[PDB]
Amino acid sequence: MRIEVTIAKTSPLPAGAIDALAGELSRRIQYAFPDNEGHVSVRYAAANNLSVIGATKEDKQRISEILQETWESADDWFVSE
């Protein structure tokens, strides 16, 4: 399964957050999907978009939920220099 996340450039994150986000998301994906290789990429695009290839609708809802939860727990897993 391949997971791609795009963030609108109109919303800049500190010079370290994107890499941190991609790392946190990947760990979450691996825990949720032990039997399937998950690859997560994060890049700036004209618009915010989430694309999932090689997954089922239920997997995709769970992933959206995971993204929601990780995103909501940002103060705990995100560290800034």
Side-chain angles (χ1 to χ4, degrees):
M1 289 161 47
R2 290 180 181 177
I3 298 168
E4 299 180 340
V5 179
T6 66
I7 284 169
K9 180 180 170 64
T10 49
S11 304
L13 312 187
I18 290 274
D19 290 339
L21 171 62
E24 189 67 20
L25 290 171
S26 63
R27 290 180 300 191
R28 296 280 189 163
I29 290 302
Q30 174 170 176
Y31 179 90
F33 298 89
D35 192 14
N36 290 339
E37 192 70 19
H39 292 295
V40 181
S41 295
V42 180
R43 59 183 60 194
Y44 291 115
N48 188 53
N49 300 127
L50 181 75
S51 183
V52 180
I53 299 270
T56 61
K57 300 180 180 56
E58 284 295 300
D59 290 338
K60 181 180 170 171
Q61 290 171 341
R62 180 60 162 79
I63 290 167
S64 296
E65 290 177 349
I66 290 174
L67 166 69
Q68 290 170 276
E69 290 180 344
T70 297
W71 186 231
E72 289 179 348
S73 69
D75 60 10
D76 289 341
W77 74 260
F78 176 59
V79 207
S80 64
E81 292 290 340

